[PDB]
Amino acid sequence: ASALGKLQDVVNQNAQALNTLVKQLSSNFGAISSVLNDILSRLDPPEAE
Amino acid sequence: ASVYAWNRKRISNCVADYSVLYNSASFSTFKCYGVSPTKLNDLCFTNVY
């Protein structure tokens, strides 16, 4: 099953990039929370910006 | 209580109305950090001290 090394490598690289992006959707980045809806619901626009 | 040995009361399992406190005229200061005083009747918390 080791014949198709390059094709599997390419598939794995693309999947890794997509998974990294989706996981990056969930880092605080310094804000109060990593979810936008709670930020909008808890704070007024001047303090939520 | 004194400044030291300050009281600590736990509040849970209730319907909390925060418009009664904000509408109070006596309160000279009502600073809110991390939350909007107007957007307090729309939230839900686990424990209030």
Side-chain angles (χ1 to χ4, degrees):
Chain A
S2 69
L4 318 179
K6 297 184 178 293
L7 278 60
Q8 278 307 126
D9 190 0
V10 165
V11 175
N12 298 349
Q13 279 177 355
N14 299 344
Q16 264 188 11
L18 277 175
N19 280 350
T20 308
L21 205 67
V22 177
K23 274 186 178 180
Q24 276 293 91
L25 283 172
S26 169
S27 62
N28 224 350
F29 288 127
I32 67 172
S33 68
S34 65
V35 298
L36 202 65
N37 267 295
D38 291 331
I39 296 186
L40 273 297
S41 66
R42 296 229 306 266
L43 281 85
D44 290 331
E47 211 188 7
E49 274 195 4
Chain B
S2 302
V3 178
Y4 84 108
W6 40 273
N7 279 356
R8 174 42 81 71
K9 180 195 159 181
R10 207 189 42 82
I11 291 155
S12 298
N13 284 297
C14 69
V15 160
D17 196 301
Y18 309 87
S19 86
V20 288
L21 304 179
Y22 210 65
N23 300 356
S24 295
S26 333
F27 298 156
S28 52
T29 299
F30 211 113
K31 315 272 166 101
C32 282
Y33 314 92
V35 75
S36 186
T38 67
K39 296 186 173 183
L40 265 171
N41 274 345
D42 291 331
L43 294 178
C44 274
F45 308 104
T46 80
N47 264 267
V48 165
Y49 300 110

